[PDB]
Scaffold this active site. Structure first.
Site, short mmCIF file in Angstrom:
data_model
loop_
_atom_site.label_atom_id
_atom_site.label_comp_id
_atom_site.label_asym_id
_atom_site.label_seq_id
_atom_site.Cartn_x
_atom_site.Cartn_y
_atom_site.Cartn_z
N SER B 200 4.99 -7.76 -2.76
CA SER B 200 6.40 -7.34 -2.67
C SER B 200 6.62 -5.97 -3.34
O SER B 200 6.01 -4.98 -2.93
CB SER B 200 7.31 -8.43 -3.26
OG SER B 200 8.65 -7.99 -3.35
N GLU B 324 8.17 -13.82 6.49
CA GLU B 324 8.58 -12.91 5.43
C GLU B 324 10.07 -12.96 5.14
O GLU B 324 10.49 -12.84 3.99
CB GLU B 324 8.17 -11.47 5.78
CG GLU B 324 6.67 -11.22 5.78
CD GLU B 324 6.09 -11.11 4.38
OE1 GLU B 324 6.88 -11.13 3.40
OE2 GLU B 324 4.84 -11.00 4.26
N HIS B 437 8.00 -15.49 1.91
CA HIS B 437 7.64 -14.36 1.07
C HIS B 437 7.18 -14.86 -0.31
O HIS B 437 7.91 -15.59 -0.98
CB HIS B 437 8.89 -13.50 0.93
CG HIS B 437 8.67 -12.16 0.31
ND1 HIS B 437 7.85 -11.20 0.87
CD2 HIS B 437 9.19 -11.60 -0.81
CE1 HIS B 437 7.88 -10.11 0.13
NE2 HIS B 437 8.68 -10.32 -0.90
#
Ligand code: Q4Q
Ligand code: Q4Q
Ligand code: NAG
Ligand code: NAG
Ligand code: NAG
Lengths: 535, 533
Positions: B200, B324, B437
């Site tokens: 990230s 995601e 995610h």
């Protein structure tokens, strides 16, 4: 008369006719060819609405095709049957408003459903007398009464100075309308049923049919419609009043010519002079664009076809629509660099981009970019076979597939019974190269049943396939449903609906039901692109 | 006094702790200071090297977490709390952690340096999911993770000012990297084999170290998990950082010097309280205080830098998880919730598009809707929901990754790409969110090796496989196992073939095209649309 065939003598509103007994493979048919339905639109009548044919005396001989409407003649591949089959097969004349009737022999004793064919050819060409439009097979095998008319094309049919009295526009469509009125009044004399009239046509013929649906005075003249590879909506089938005016006056200038004076001067020009300059008035280098087509006049067409199909109630309308597998391929050899019928036409990325500008001539640089990006295969962005095929798809989707999908969707959402097809069979007899696939126009010879002619070398299965297509078309004309009632064995053809979006594949295999007519890609053309252009 | 646990670094002596991993002991040295505490007049300022210390510094426990917003959406829910700070909050937070085999490696061992994510507003190196003991025990890795300032403290910038230059959280990372160079050999680490990895915002940080010259001498290889320096969320312009910093100042009752002086008098929580209020639009996957294109740390926009960069001697592993976007939907998009199936209407989809693509004009938002709509089922709520997730995932992660990979490969880099498609049996988020995610991390770090976590045996074997890929990449620049003939092999990503692999319970499968059509839409078409509004 007295020593003639009594089965070939018929009277219509204008007088007596003598037709001819034709030989079809299954037996005889009756033909009445070159029947005049309008006064010859010549001299001071050029660009004018047609007038009804004035009665004749004696027996009009109706045994041969009459003149073809004056028109551009294709020169790209001389002697090549692929192009020549579409070329005029009778003398070119402005005196050309004649129609043709085929019926069983002897003529039906009970009132028989009528099919009326309206030829295509981009509103710049065409003729009811071409071999591909021979009505004898439908008449013989299916018992149909078949009618087809000549209508004025090119400048003669569609040159307009909107608002003027001397060139009001859309007169070629009025020619068609006059022929439909002739059928209503006279077809009963041939055994035809004026209460059961189905229009069908392909390309500009399909677009014409669509316009008769959209024009109130025509709606009383037929009951059902078939649109093959063409629509009234879309980028080529109409121009605005402003654009027709601009093209008409440019052409006038190009041949050396207040609307009255301009038209009076045009009327002194040889027909061929007009034809020789016809293509010079297109605003851009383009394919699938035609100089003189129907005009949004606020008369025949009260608004754009787009607006009319969006707000129309089509409750009592039954309609059959469809496309061929490769609508765009034919057009590429008439203007896109890198394309030819005589090689494989593998093209570069640069040639693809250039080809997009020509195929979508009204696109801004950004819209053109959108098209290129949408159609590119991003796994093989430089592959020349995919690029060639994508160029074909761009042209076929923009001009035919997506307009058709749009038309079916609007018609279905608004009350119509719609049946949709894709035509996927490539004739074993096709003379165009394989890369072109199943090109624009190449379903026609099957609907009309040419494979039934033994001299044409079609395969046995193609013969059977043609009979299937004649059944669908004639059952649709008869009932508004292409399916046969006496036959629950063969798979059914479900109507196109907004919810399920069902259409069928037409090929040698039994009907297969598919869903969604290029749904994703047509959302791009039909919903997104207009927004992008309008900004 | 265990001598395996006693280390002398440049600053002085440290005492680590011997931990138990399921397969054996490991040496951990936790809460090592690498910078002077950035407190008082040092708030917003670049980090300074830690001063030396007397005696033996206790390095047996995790230090404080950098002051940050704490999530409150689902209080007590494992799925969120696992990312929440697990130690006290403090601005005094610049410490790093080292795990090594027990005993200390006999030869110089390749180093892995973890940079946590959390959108540059959160994160900590002390989280259970970043536990380096498994990689050190099983793969013999030397693993390093550092705390770096986040939120206002790490990234509030008044560009051009001396007292808030911007990017200081990036500078914290870099100072830790220098610390590794200078000290890691004392732990048995090889300063000449240093691989960065991060997820990230951590992945984006890794990318920024790649794009920043002074960082390039501090590492040799990079792994970017679900994040990139390029793309819509990872950076802001100088103008927009300035705008946000001044608005926040205004919100808390505060000429650059004077403005920053007043901000330095404010208690940390006061700044956090107004952190989110400076975003220009209602949005998700957007963060207030992030790296700034300053013309210094970043000499130009990341997109401009990747386009012109020469990446000849770089090896990079990049990838994404299967879903995601799903995690972000429940933090702002109406109709979405972890506690139901989140079936949405068409109107909710359009509304959601404006929030997930906040910079989009009407026309651009329209383009996004038409592209993602299934025109066979334009109102199917299951598809609309999954489309909403895809829009967010594609816009923010997948397409930026594909863009980065393509530019790096074209410009000389050795690139490997993956999609992570395994949903843990232990996942506490609902099924509709898929593989969200952040949920590959626990496998890469080897958490399924902890018997008390109840992963399946298949997942335990899968985790070991990923630990091999990652550490083999660290060791060699190539994730393929040399002791393994045909598995099949993981091929490099290239612009021509575009090959990447699926990471799941099944053996590697090679695929071509990373959302190729859809990313052309995001990467090629949309920017032109917006640059014409
Ligand atoms: C195949 C179907 N049509 C008739 C229905 C035949 C030809 N006309 S066409 O409009 O299809 C293609 C065309 C276009 C422009 C030029 C100059 C020549 C030919
Ligand atoms: C899942 C992984 N990350 C850490 C790497 C955890 C959360 N941070 S996040 O940016 O991913 C999602 C998010 C965004 C905005 C708010 C307010 C809350 C949560
Ligand atoms: C195909 O023919 C056209 C016209 O002759 C030409 O422009 C094109 O280059 C040809 N393609 C190839 C590769 O031969
Ligand atoms: C097919 O029949 C023969 C070939 O067997 C040939 O003489 C004839 O010209 C062909 N017909 C057509 C129109 O292709
Ligand atoms: C799911 O939950 C949210 C908030 O609890 C709610 O707004 C939404 O309507 C729910 N979805 C359903 C059951 O349609």
């Amino acid at each position: 008369e007295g020593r003639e065939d009594p089965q070939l003598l018929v009277r219509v509103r204008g007088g007596q006719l003598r037709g001819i007994r034709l030989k079809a493979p299954g037996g005889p048919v009756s033909a009445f060819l070159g029947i005049p339905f309008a006064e010859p639109p010549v001299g001071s009548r050029r660009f004018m609405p047609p007038e009804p044919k004035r009665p004749w005396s004696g027996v009009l001989d109706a045994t041969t095709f009459q003149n073809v409407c004056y028109q551009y003649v294709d020169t790209l591949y001389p002697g090549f049957e692929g192009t020549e089959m579409w070329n005029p097969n009778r003398e070119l004349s402005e005196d050309c408003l004649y129609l043709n009737v085929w019926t069983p022999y002897p003529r039906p004793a009970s009132p028989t459903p009528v099919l009326i064919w309206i030829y295509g050819g981009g509103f710049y060409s065409g003729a009811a007398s071409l071999d591909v439009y021979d009505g004898r097979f439908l008449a013989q095998v299916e018992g149909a009464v078949l009618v087809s008319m000549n209508y004025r094309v090119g400048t003669f049919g569609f040159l307009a100075l909107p608002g003027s009295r001397e060139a009001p526009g859309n007169v070629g469509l009025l020619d068609q309308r006059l022929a439909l009125q002739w059928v209503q009044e006279n077809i009963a004399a041939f055994g035809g049923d004026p209460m059961s009239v189905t229009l069908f046509g392909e390309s500009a013929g399909a677009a014409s049919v669509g316009m008769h649906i959209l024009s109130l005075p025509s709606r009383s003249l037929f009951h059902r419609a078939v649109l093959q590879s063409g629509t009234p909506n879309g980028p080529w089938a109409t121009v605005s009043a402003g654009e027709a005016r601009r093209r008409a006056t440019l052409l006038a200038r190009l041949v050396g010519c207040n609307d009255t004076e301009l038209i009076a001067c045009l009327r002194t020009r040889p027909a061929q002079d007009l034809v020789d300059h016809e293509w010079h008035v297109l605003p851009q280098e383009s394919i699938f664009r035609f100089s003189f087509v129907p005009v949004v006049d606020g008369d025949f067409l009260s608004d754009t076809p787009e607006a009319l199909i969006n707000t129309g109630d089509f409750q009592d309308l039954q309609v059959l629509v469809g496309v061929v597998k490769d609508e765009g391929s034919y057009f590429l050899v008439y203007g896109v660099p890198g394309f030819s019928k005589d090689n494989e036409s593998l093209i570069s990325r640069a040639q693809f981009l250039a080809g997009v500008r020509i195929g979508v001539p009204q696109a801004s640089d950004l819209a053109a970019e959108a098209v290129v990006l949408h159609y590119t295969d991003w796994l093989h962005p430089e592959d020349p076979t995919h690029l060639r095929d994508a160029m074909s798809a761009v042209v076929g989707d923009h001009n035919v597939v997506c307009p058709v999908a749009q038309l079916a969707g609007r018609l279905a959402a608004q009350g119509a019974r719609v049946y949709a097809y894709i035509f996927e069979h490539r004739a074993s007899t096709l003379t165009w190269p394989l890369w072109m696939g199943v090109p624009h126009g190449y379903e026609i010879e099957f609907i009309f049943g040419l494979p039934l002619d033994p001299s044409l070398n079609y395969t046995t299965e193609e013969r059977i396939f043609a009979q299937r297509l004649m059944k669908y078309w004639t059952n649709f004309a008869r009932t508004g449903d292409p399916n046969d009632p006496r036959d629950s064995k063969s798979p059914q053809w479900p109507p196109y609906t907004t919810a399920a979006q069902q259409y069928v594949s037409l090929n040698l295999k039994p009907l297969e039901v598919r869903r969604g007519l290029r749904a994703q890609t047509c959302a791009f053309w039909n919903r997104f692109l207009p927004k992008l252009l309008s900004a």
